[PDB]
């Protein structure tokens, strides 16, 4: 394999595009220099070897080589879902809905084999050539159920505007509804083209305005009542009152045929 261009850097390293010379196959390569991490990078591989789904970025292999680690990962040639949300516009409601469905199938599968991605946001929803959505990056993901026994979480991980309010208050919390919340901030982004708030916290006027049901404001006013009816159920402060993926699957707007 040989490295063509540089797809998305940041911290852990870079995903670079790599095309093989002879075979006519291109598939991305995360590059991690452990000088910082060795016990973390083996957790992402652990968790990647578990995964196999049409809505999750496939894993292929890895080669440790000195301080360097290479994670060979399915190439998603449609880029990020971040780059298809237009500022203060968002996207066509029928495209929003199609992506939510494929997003609920990826997380329904994760949750079923006891993984939680923990940092779901548009940057981490890649897309293939036929524009099917894939869940990407499991280096913050973790095992919230093993041998049919659930472990509540307590560590603060994620990105502040997608994170669930209980992750800043409660000292321990279930992993599933934190993924359900993130997926609802992603639904507001796809239909509103802005993120509602910095963080779901209490000295934050925007979140306090949502809890007061001031939907006559941004971003909620750019969203139609059907899919705003559903967001009302996902972005609930109390995790045990919050909706679940089987009850999203029966939502009016989730099963509404959109043009
Ligand atoms: C950050 C990241 C991880 C990744 N894993 N697998 C992939 O395809 N990517 C990425 C692919 C792109 C991309 C960029 C331009 N055109 C198509 C795809 C960008 C970032 C990533």
Curated annotation (Swiss-Prot):
Positions of transmembrane segments: none
Enzyme Commission number(s): 2.7.11.1
Tissue expression per record: Expressed ubiquitously with the most abundant expression in thymus, testis, small intestine and colon.
GO molecular function terms listed in the Swiss-Prot or TrEMBL record: ATP binding; histone H3T11 kinase activity; protein domain specific binding; protein kinase activity; protein serine kinase activity; protein serine/threonine kinase activity
Region span, Interaction with CLSPN: 1-254
This protein's UniProt keywords: ATP-binding, Cell cycle, Chromosome, Cytoplasm, Cytoskeleton, Disease variant, DNA damage, DNA repair, Isopeptide bond, Kinase, Nucleotide-binding, Nucleus, Phosphoprotein, Serine/threonine-protein kinase, Transferase, Ubl conjugation
Regulation: Activated through phosphorylation predominantly by ATR but also by ATM in response to DNA damage or inhibition of DNA replication. Activation is modulated by several mediators including CLSPN, BRCA1 and FEM1B. Proteolytic cleavage at the C-terminus by SPRTN during normal DNA replication activates the protein kinase activity.
Keyword Kinase: yes
Biological role stated in the UniProt entry: Serine/threonine-protein kinase which is required for checkpoint-mediated cell cycle arrest and activation of DNA repair in response to the presence of DNA damage or unreplicated DNA. May also negatively regulate cell cycle progression during unperturbed cell cycles. This regulation is achieved by a number of mechanisms that together help to preserve the integrity of the genome. Recognizes the substrate consensus sequence [R-X-X-S/T]. Binds to and phosphorylates CDC25A, CDC25B and CDC25C.
UniProt disease annotation: Oocyte/zygote/embryo maturation arrest 21: An autosomal dominant, female infertility disorder characterized by zygote development arrest due to failure of pronuclei fusion.
Domain topic, free-text comment: The autoinhibitory region (AIR) inhibits the activity of the kinase domain.
Name the UniProt record assigns to this protein: Serine/threonine-protein kinase Chk1
Source species of the chain: Homo sapiens
Native organism taxonomy: Eukaryota, Metazoa, Chordata, Craniata, Vertebrata
Span of the entire protein shown here: 9 to 270 of 476
């Amino acid at each position: 394999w040989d490295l063509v261009q540089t797809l998305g850097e940041g911290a852990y390293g870079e995903v670079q595009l790599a095309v093989n010379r002879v075979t006519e196959e291109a598939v991305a390569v995360k590059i991690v220099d452990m000088k910082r991490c060795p016990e973390n990078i083996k957790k992402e591989i652990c968790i990647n070897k578990m995964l196999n789904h049409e809505n999750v970025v496939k894993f292929y292999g890895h080669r440790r080589e000195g301080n360097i680690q290479y994670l060979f990962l399915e190439y998603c040639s449609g880029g990020e879902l971040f780059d298809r949300i237009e500022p203060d516009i968002g996207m066509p409601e029928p495209d929003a809905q199609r992506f939510f469905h494929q997003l609920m199938a990826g997380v329904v599968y994760l949750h079923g084999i006891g993984i939680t991605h923990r940092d779901i946001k548009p940057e981490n929803l890649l897309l293939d050539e036929r524009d099917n959505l894939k869940i990407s990056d499991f280096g913050l993901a973790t095992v919230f159920r093993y041998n049919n026994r659930e472990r509540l979480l307590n560590k603060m991980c994620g990105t502040l505007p997608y994170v669930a309010p209980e992750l800043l208050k409660r000292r321990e919390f279930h992993a599933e509804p934190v993924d359900v919340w993130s997926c609802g901030i992603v639904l507001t982004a796809m239909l509103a083209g802005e993120l509602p708030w910095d963080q779901p916290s209490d000295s934050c006027q925007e979140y306090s305005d949502w809890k007061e049901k001031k939907t006559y404001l941004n971003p909620w006013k750019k969203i139609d009542s059907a899919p705003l009816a559903l967001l009302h159920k996902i972005l609930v402060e109390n995790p045990s009152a919050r909706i679940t993926i089987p009850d999203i699957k029966k939502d009016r707007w989730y099963n509404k045929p959109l043009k």
